Write a protein that binds this ligand. Structure first.
Ligand SMILES: [Zn+2]
Ligand SMILES: [Zn+2]
Ligand SMILES: [Zn+2]
Ligand SMILES: [Zn+2]
Length: 101
């Protein structure tokens, strides 16, 4: 199984969203992230959230408070339970280059 690569949308003045599409057999998505500093292994990070449920065909993490700027880098890893087994998107990095809304 391959965890879908997370889609990251950054909002102005603040907030961001991290999501993946859902499919049969996924029962959890979790996001672990840090800003402008690498994750040290599979640590919890600054943001560590298990998304409660899929909604509208996606699993979505939403931050409403953090003001990201162009050139900021989000470092992250995600976890999915697929058919009862755990899998990750490892070594995620996203450089903010622009806003979605
Ligand atoms: Zn892989
Ligand atoms: Zn289907
Ligand atoms: Zn740490
Ligand atoms: Zn976790």
């Amino acid at each position: 199984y391959e965890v879908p690569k997370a889609k990251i949308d950054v909002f102005y003045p603040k907030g961001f969203e991290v999501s993946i599409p859902d499919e049969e057999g996924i029962t959890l998505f979790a996001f672990h992230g840090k800003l402008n500093e690498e994750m040290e292994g599979l640590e919890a990070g600054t943001w560590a959230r298990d998304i409660v449920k899929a909604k509208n065909g996606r699993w979505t993490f939403r931050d409403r408070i953090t003001a990201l700027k162009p050139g900021d880098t989000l470092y992250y890893w995600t976890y999915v339970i697929y058919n009862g087994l755990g899998y990750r998107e490892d070594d995620g990095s996203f450089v903010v280059n622009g806003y979605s809304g």
